[PDB]
């Protein structure tokens, strides 16, 4: 009745199309439990929203600041606030924000009131979709917008993972790697730099240094599951 991930298939019983982006994909049945789906619904939005912001940032960094490698931005960046000064502000600010979001997930409608200012309050809303101050402007129908958000978000989540493995294998940024693909599309695919057959296995070399020296300490920098690479 609705488009599915695999056309012609029957969606699992626990999936019925109520949620946005519900295309009936759940081969392992992780969403069968009602409470588990409610939690997994929140994490998908949070993961997607973080990924979209992260993917946009990495692309903009390379265009604006081509010299700096987004992978090495952790050590490359220098600021007066120092390493542990930045972390301190980040921890406390994120601890407040995340706990309040977490509380609404458990008991919705309890953390809508503004603590400091009495008059201001968050209108009634659904879990994971705060309104009011967070949404000053809405281009159109929310139902359509929610589907747009998740579909772009799901793509962004894959996009970020593409950056990491491309960065670890090719040792380059996202746009820089793409330019390499366009130069020699046949000789740059993962098939054209790695292969495993009975008796032999060839894998790309991890182009990220094993360890990083950062202000008198050594930070391990391992390639993700480098032993299982193709």
């Amino acid at each position: 009745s609705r488009p599915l991930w695999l056309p012609g298939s029957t969606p699992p019983a626990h999936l019925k199309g109520d949620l946005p982006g519900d295309f009936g994909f759940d081969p392992l049945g992780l969403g069968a439990n009602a409470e588990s789906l409610k939690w997994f619904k929140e994490s998908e939005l949070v993961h997607s929203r973080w990924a979209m912001a992260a993917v946009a940032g990495i692309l903009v960094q390379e265009i604006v600041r081509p010299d700096v490698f987004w992978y090495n931005a952790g050590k490359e960046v220098e600021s007066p606030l120092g390493p542990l000064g930045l972390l301190a502000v980040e921890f406390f600010l994120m601890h407040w924000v995340e706990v309040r979001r977490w509380q609404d997930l458990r008991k919705p409608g309890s953390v809508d009131q503004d603590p400091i200012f009495s008059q201001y309050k968050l209108p009634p809303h659904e879990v994971g979709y705060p309104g009011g101050v967070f949404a000053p402007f809405i281009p159109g129908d929310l139902a359509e917008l929610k589907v747009k958000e998740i579909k772009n978000g799901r793509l962004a989540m894959l996009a970020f993972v593409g950056f990491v493995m491309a960065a670890q294998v090719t040792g380059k940024g996202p746009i820089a790697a793409l330019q390499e693909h366009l130069a020699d599309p046949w000789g740059t695919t993962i098939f054209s730099k790695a292969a495993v057959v009975p008796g032999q296995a060839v894998a790309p070399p991890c182009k990220i240094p094993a360890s990083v020296s950062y202000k008198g300490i050594e930070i391990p920098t391992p390639c993700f599951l480098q032993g299982l690479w193709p």
Binding site: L6, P7, G8, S9, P185, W186, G187, T188, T189, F191, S192, K193, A194, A195, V197, P198, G199, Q200, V202
Partner: protein, 227 residues
């Protein structure tokens, strides 16, 4: 009343001539399960159709390019000038992506008949798909399906079965004699008695392994022939 594979042999109950090219031949009784018979029928069509392309390719390629020795044609250095020494990794990438799409579409048709007839991108386009394994429509531009379809199915499977046997003759002959199909045929005519299977059967001419752009690929013959 149809003729059977052997004289005076009783055909299995589940083989009653519904399918084309039905001689009532199933010594292992693999078609007893009705669902299994459908799947095996599809694989017979796939082997039949791929094998016919394989036989045609080997023979035609031999005529146009006698020296290529199709058995070795897979090596990158033997490819035509435009594609000579192409990166096999990138070349495989095209086939995997394109074949994965096409074959999953065919597979989904078997799982749920008639579900994948319509074009996904351009709405409206469809194929008739009168029977599983016979999409028709765009796959039959000349419209030969119209008419005596049953007879055409019989002709397809009978020729396809012959191709399967014929192609594996090419492979074993190349492994034993080291020559292509037409080349081996000429050799037999020259010296029918001196040059035949009785002599060549004991030798396997395939090297143990080959190096394809730095990757070692194991190779084997279909019998423990004297290397």
């Amino acid at each position: 009343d149809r003729k059977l594979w052997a004289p005076g042999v009783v055909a299995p109950e589940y083989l009653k001539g519904d399918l084309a090219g039905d001689y009532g031949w199933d010594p292992l009784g693999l078609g007893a399960d009705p669902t299994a018979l459908k799947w095996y029928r599809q694989s017979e069509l796939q082997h039949a159709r791929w094998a016919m392309l394989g036989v045609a390719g080997v023979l035609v390629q031999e005529i146009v390019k006698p020296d290529v020795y199709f058995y070795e044609a897979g090596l990158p250095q033997n490819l035509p000038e435009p594609f000579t020494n192409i990166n096999m990794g990138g070349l495989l990438a095209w086939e995997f992506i394109l074949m994965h799409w096409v074959e999953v579409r065919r597979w989904q048709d078997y799982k749920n008949f008639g579900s994948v007839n319509e074009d996904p991108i351009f709405k409206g386009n469809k194929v008739p798909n009168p029977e599983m394994g016979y999409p028709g429509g765009i796959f039959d531009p000349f419209g030969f399906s119209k008419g005596n379809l049953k007879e055409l199915q019989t002709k397809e499977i009978k020729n396809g079965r012959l191709a399967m046997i014929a192609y594996m003759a090419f492979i074993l002959q190349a492994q034993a004699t080291g020559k292509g199909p037409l080349a081996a045929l000429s050799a037999h005519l020259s010296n029918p008695f001196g040059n035949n299977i009785l002599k060549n059967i004991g030798t396997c001419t395939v090297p143990h392994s080959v190096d394809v752009q730095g990757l070692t690929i194991p190779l084997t013959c279909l019998w423990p022939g004297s290397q």
